[PDB]
Amino acid sequence: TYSKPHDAATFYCPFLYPSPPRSPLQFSGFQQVSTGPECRNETLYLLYNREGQTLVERSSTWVKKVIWYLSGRNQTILQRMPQTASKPSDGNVQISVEDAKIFGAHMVPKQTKLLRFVVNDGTRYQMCVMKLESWAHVFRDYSVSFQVRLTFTEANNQTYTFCTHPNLIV
Amino acid sequence: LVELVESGGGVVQPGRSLRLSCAASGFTFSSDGMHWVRQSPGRGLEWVAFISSDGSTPYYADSVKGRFTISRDNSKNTLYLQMNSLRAEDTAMYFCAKDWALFRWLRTFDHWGQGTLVTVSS
Amino acid sequence: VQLVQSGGGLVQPGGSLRVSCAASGFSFSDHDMDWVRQAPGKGFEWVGRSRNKDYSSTTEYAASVRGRFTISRHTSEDLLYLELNTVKTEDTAVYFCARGPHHSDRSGYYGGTFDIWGQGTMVTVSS
Amino acid sequence: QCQRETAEKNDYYRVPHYWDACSRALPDQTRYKYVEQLVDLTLNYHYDASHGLDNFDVLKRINVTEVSLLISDFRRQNRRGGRTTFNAAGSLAPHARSLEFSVRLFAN
Amino acid sequence: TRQVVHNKLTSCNYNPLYLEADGRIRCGKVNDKAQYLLGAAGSVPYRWRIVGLDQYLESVKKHKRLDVCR
Amino acid sequence: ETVMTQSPATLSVSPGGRATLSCRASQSVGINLAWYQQKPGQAPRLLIYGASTRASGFPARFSGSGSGTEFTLTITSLQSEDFAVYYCQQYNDWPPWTFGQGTKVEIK
Amino acid sequence: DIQMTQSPSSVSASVGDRVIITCRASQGISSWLAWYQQKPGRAPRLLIYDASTLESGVPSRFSGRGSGTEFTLTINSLQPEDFATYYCQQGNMFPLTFGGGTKVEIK
């Protein structure tokens, strides 16, 4: 047997007390199922995760945060940016202005990250940190730019470590 | 390759019945659902009916409810649709369509057959 | 493994000449192919290398011929080309195509020795 | 850039950064593969970061070997694509090594 | 360690050295690419569900222990 | 529950041009929108699924934008093989899966 | 770019004679040296590669030694087929440089 989304959402109806907030990172899809008088006209949302199971949730600030995040995850420009990176001199086919404005809204103008890693340098582990600086801009001409500056350093600006000069045979 | 071949579609007056069929190949016909979507010449698309993977639950459009009966044979990998008790409808092309579930309750038409033309008029 | 040459002959000063060779008994794409030349009564001189199908800059030349000679490969017919455009009098010699190291050999990108040569083609520059 | 038959006159001397300068260039297919992978991983992280989700799952996938080798290739020869739609470059200082790429796309 | 091997030839500036079977250690060439090349490396050794309450009870009565979230 | 409306009914784009065809949802559709291409006298073919992901057999020229209520299909460098009728459909409210009246893209 | 000094410049020996031939490179090349044989009128044939590896099909009498700026290649049991020209080739860096050729003739 297979039911219709309305039956699925109203299965647990009514919802009287709040649900635990969850992170958008865990969810992979969402569906808005509206109800009428049967559940005080409440708007339920069926949230699909990567483990193949549905979570019906009442509209809330965090649920909306999930909706907005999942909404923007699959925007075209995010998907085709790597394919544009693979194609060399002949590689570019223009993008739409609607995605340019969506990219602007979703992507923050600048982000900086420090990420620690350990590399095995013979018998010792050398801790080093990568300072990542990235810019995402949508100019007034609906042009989009993504700049990244990846940098590896030693925890105390030490020279000639094993994170700097890793000397790979290629 | 996935092929859906529609057959059994002719011309009847009102009150008579037509029985479309769709021969499915390229898939076990058991993993996914089948649908019917009609398109009247120069008009939009209209959903007609859906049958669940196990044929236990059928669904129909309000504009067609009561008249039609969808069926499937998971052993034969074949789809039928009996259009009993007919009437006035300009919708000409009936297309058999295979679906695909993105998630439990997220499924849409994935493949379409060449469709059979059905005209119903006295 | 066999290597058969073509081209060569006479060429008017400042003219052009094509020497090519076809490779059999081995995967022409999977090996780098160099050209070597012998002047009458002199030692050998290296002309250049064609890389082993994994590189975008596919040609290397000696400084004297770096600006005048072009090494190329066929799009799909497994042929090696060496075009001597605007040949000079000091380029008169017998040109052999040779096979270099395999793409799984580390040495081939930066150097190597050869192992098989073709029968050669005589290129004579005179008026 | 590195010109062998200049440094190897000596068996007991090598200039600073000789290895990375004189190192074998990356095969085109590995340069493109790694570039596509790194840009995808970092763009996915930037996206998550914008929404306030510091997604460690995307971060762990970054292989420092791939990026370091790209640094060697873009310092070796910088690359571009095009109104150039791509531009990458590598820098090597005694205290830090860095890679800076920029993929731009136009709508107008 | 990278310091001792560099000290074997400081003038190599952390560039690999080459040990011949004779025993002499020299400064390494990028193009010898052999195993006898000290101080180089092939790869870098770097190192950076909703369960219903009924499902929980059912998935806890079996494995009789308390903590079920590994 | 959600009737999908499309506009314009006919859009005249010169070859190789860019067409932005709109689809507006009467009621929330989230990201459950799919676009189908239908060339004359042929069965429809899935074109785009999700709000943006293009289905196999359609080149990168076709981009899918939109969220919530407004969705727009953008077709760049429109070649001869791109002139057909495009329908947008919602798969959020099930019975019935509603389509728009479609938009025809004709040569200018 | 790398000068090649071959010694001796010309040599004569009989069948059964021992010849040793040296080749010198201007700067040190580890082992990227090869030895070739040119029969008059023919194309060259590789004889020894990697300085010491004897190529299959070549008589086992050859044996290569040396390094740096001086390498040596012996021809222990001269055979009636051993009248030809032997040439050294440097493979450490581009451009490859070759010797003047060593003429081995019967006595």
TrEMBL record, chain A:
Keywords: Viral envelope protein, Virion
GO cellular component, one term: viral envelope
Protein known as: Envelope glycoprotein UL130
Source organism: Human cytomegalovirus (HHV-5)
Region of the whole protein represented: 45 to 214 of 214
Automatic annotation (TrEMBL), chain D:
Entry protein name: UL131A
Organism: Human cytomegalovirus
From TrEMBL, chain E:
Domain of life: Viruses
Name of the protein described by the UniProt record: UL128
Annotated source species: Human cytomegalovirus
Lineage: Viruses, Duplodnaviria, Heunggongvirae, Peploviricota, Herviviricetes
Originating gene: UL128
Included stretch of the parent chain: 85 to 163 of 171
